[PDB]
């Protein structure tokens, strides 16, 4: 099949900037390309077809160019309504989609507020302990959450979750949950999540002692 | 204009046959030049074209799903449906139907319906408090929340103080644990000086199991 | 300058049953510069000399563009009969213009088959010259009514060219542009 490589993966922009998203086909697709816009939770909306033809009702600030193996979607003056995800679809041989490009709101670097929650006594009665590490209102999205149990680095028993960019302060929040059995939880004393982020000169560590 | 509504069971079991129906209103299914499509989108992934049916019945499929996909048309009811058999866990996605004037793109879309594939049947969630502590307080702002753990299927809806508290609320997207069950946490940042004068109650609602839990989150001094 | 480039260099072409027509007036036409490339695999003028266009002033120029099979290009001429000439696009007997067709197997042919291009297969009567029929009514070839559904003696009037790159030159897509002066 024809594979669409879309670049960049994530894109930080401000209102009024000139956004350029590129789509690359694995083989020649001539001018048979389409561009879609999709906001989180809603259905995609058609923007461009035939690589350069604007879909009816689409604002004129959208423009499509390119042919062969290189295609470009250009937004002249970005607007708040345009912060979404954009996909390119070829239709030279069946219909294949690109992985998409996310246009996020750019803002100044914001350091996260780090919190840590031990497992509740109600959950421990069930035989499971869940330790929650919270990273509040940071930017950019890139952040590392390192779990340490009695100074031993943990990996393989934690899962993360990132919120969509807040439409007001343009920040992200992250929730990392460490899960042990109650028996394994009572085998250790020191539980810590070490947060490394661009807004932090040194990694911040929040921790508690079991008890 | 053309309006497309997806319907079907959102909790199909593995190796069974997934069936979804798209109700077309505003335009006819057996006249004109239209390409009635099925498109699915896994969570956090890109779109995947399933297949199309022309107004004459001729079908065209994505070659990867050609052996498991059959798209038919019920012209009496003016509906067209998709059947996907031998379904595995990788077929869990949001399924859209759409019209296209060409065999190339899709210009009209439906709201999309969520279809989950798992052997684990419906289960209500357990709600545990994320108590605000000294370790859960940074300055004059404290952090508290609720852990919505071990439920199936999606989704749950979490509100705070019956909707009276919205500022600073962060409800995180659920994570599919290795146990086949979903877990979710909802937090909120509040002033520290209110941890004993203001009551904080998260309202967890999981309609797939008819579960409604109101959990009161209180601080923990230790 | 006349927008002959938009007609010939169009990314997408119309189906033969719903053939596009572009009215061309009030411009300077590069008539002799149209046939400067060797891409045209069929260039037949009727009533006018292709060399005498640069010295002729016309009131209107109608550019009819569509896509048909290779073996059906011979039907785009006055007094021709078949399926394209009778049911899709019909030129008059006193036609005054030029028919320009070229092989477009690169664009209008796809690996899985390009089904965007269709032709009218059934019709109760032949078309009058320059008549465009875009109705998708179920054709009743037989006694019982159809009620909008196909079955016995009820068929869909539009068949599609299964355009694949492996087809012979007689079944490959050909982009036609009919200039009428
Ligand atoms: C189509 O574009 C090419 C340049 O890409 C040009 O040489 C040619 O003349 C154009 N077609 C016509 C009919 O002018």
Author numbering:
A (entry chain L): 1 to 211
B (entry chain H): 1 to 222
C (entry chain R): 335 to 515
Sentences reproduced from the published study:
The spike protein (S) mediates cell entry by binding the angiotensin-converting enzyme 2 (ACE2) cellular receptor, and many neutralizing antibodies bind S.4,5,6,7 Mutations in S can therefore impart two important selective advantages: firstly, mutations to the ACE2-binding surface in the receptor-binding domain (RBD) can increase affinity for ACE2, potentially increasing viral transmissibility. In this report, we generate a panel of 25 potent mAbs (IC50 < 100 ng/mL) from vaccinees suffering breakthrough Omicron BA.2 infections. We have determined structures for complexes of four of these antibodies by X-ray crystallography and cryoelectron microscopy (cryo-EM) analysis. The BA.2 mAbs segregate into 3 adjacent clusters, two of which (left shoulder and neck in our anatomical definition of RBD topology) are hotspots for the binding of potent mAbs against early-pandemic virus, while the third cluster, which we term the right chest, spans between the neck and right flank epitopes in early-pandemic responses (note that in the early responses, right flank binders were not found to be potent [IC50 > 100 ng/mL]).
BA.2-36 (IGHV4-61) binds to the right chest region in a similar position and orientation to BA.2-13. It also contacts RBD residues 346, 444, 450, and 452, explaining its similar variant neutralization profile to BA.2-13, with neutralization seriously reduced or completely knocked out for variants containing the R346T mutation and by BA.2.3.20. (E and J) Complex of (E) Delta-RBD/BA.2-13 and (J) Delta-RBD/BA.2-36. We tested the ability of mAbs to block ACE2 interaction with S; a number of mAbs (BA.2–5, 13, 15, 21, 24, 34, 36) showed little or no ACE2-blocking function. BA.2.3.20, which has a number of mutations across the top of the shoulders, neck, and at the back of the RBD, also caused large disruption: 13/25 mAbs were knocked out, with only 6/25 retaining IC50 activity at <100 ng/mL.
